[PDB]
């Protein structure tokens, strides 16, 4: 019986965080990556060096690394709102098969690198990357019926 414990309090010695939202942040996953990466690295480094001594990076890094992600999602909710919105709307269908929305990817990435000038640096030099135009692969099945007109118009207008 996996019963749930749901106790409540609030602890004094630090300023509270701001949490984050649902599985649509999987679309924004690289978008926090290149910007908030050294914050991430210093957080996990300070966690690993204090051997067993957790709960002491909360006030420094447990606040800081969440501040950066909150800033990134606020920037993306003003910058490319519906471009984010239709993209995760695609991406909540198709099991989060992240291959399954790779045409609205290019719309969202072009919008981000336009306005918030980030990238998606998947580390590793050997193959090609995010523009593949698959050509022997497992592209999609239901090709995002509300979004094919979007990338079609982006090919049309732009």
Partner 1 sequence: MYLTYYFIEITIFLAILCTIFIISAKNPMVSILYMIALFVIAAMYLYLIGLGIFSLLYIMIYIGAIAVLFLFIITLLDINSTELSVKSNIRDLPLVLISLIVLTISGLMIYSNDSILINKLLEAFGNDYNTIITQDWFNIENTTLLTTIGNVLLTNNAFILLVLAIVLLLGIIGPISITMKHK
Partner 2 sequence: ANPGFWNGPFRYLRWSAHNRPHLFFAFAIGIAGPVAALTLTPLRRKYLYPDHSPLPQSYP
In the complex, the residues that contact partner 1 under the rule CB under 8 A are: 1-3, 5
Question: Distance between CA atoms of 23 and 80, rounded to whole angstroms?
Answer: 18
* Torsion sign over Cα 66, 68, 71, 72: negative
Question: Distance between CA atoms of 78 and 95, rounded to whole angstroms?
Answer: 27
**Among partner 2, partner 1, none, partner that 45 touches (CB below 5 to 8 angstroms by kind):** partner 2
Stretch that binds partner 2, among 42-50, 71-79, 104-112, 140-148 (CB under 8 A): 42-50
CB 143 within 8 A of CB 103: yes
82 lines the binding site for partner 2 (CB under 8 A): no
Question: Rounded to the nearest whole angstrom, what is the least distance from the CB of residue 44 to partner 1 in the complex?
Answer: 8
Question: Distance between CA atoms of 158 and 155, rounded to whole angstroms?
Answer: 6
145 lines the binding site for partner 2 (CB under 8 A): no
Q: Site residues for partner 2, window 95-134 (CB under 8 A)?
A: 124, 126-127
Residue from 118, 100, 106 nearest 153 by CA: 106
Q: Which of 41, 74, 129, 146 binds partner 2 (CB under 8 A)?
A: 41
Question: In the complex, which residues of this chain contact partner 2 (CB under 8 A)?
Answer: 41, 44-45, 48, 124, 126-127
């Amino acid at each position: 019986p996996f019963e749930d414990k749901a106790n409540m309090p609030d602890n004094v010695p630090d300023v509270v965080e701001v949490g984050a939202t649902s599985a649509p942040l999987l679309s924004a996953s690289y978008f926090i990556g290149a910007k908030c990466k050294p914050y991430n690295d210093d957080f996990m480094l300070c966690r690993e060096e204090s051997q067993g001594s957790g709960a002491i990076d909360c006030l420094k890094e447990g606040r800081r690394v969440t501040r950066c992600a909150v800033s990134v999602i606020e920037d993306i909710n003003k910058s490319c709102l519906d471009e984010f919105r239709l993209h995760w709307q695609c991406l909540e269908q198709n099991n989060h098969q992240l291959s399954g929305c790779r045409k609205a990817e290019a719309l969202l990435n072009k919008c981000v690198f336009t306005k918030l000038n980030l990238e998606k640096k998947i580390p590793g030099l050997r193959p090609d990357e995010e523009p593949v135009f698959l050509k022997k692969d497992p592209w999609i099945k239901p090709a995002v019926d509300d979004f094919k007109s979007v990338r079609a118009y982006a090919e049309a207008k732009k």
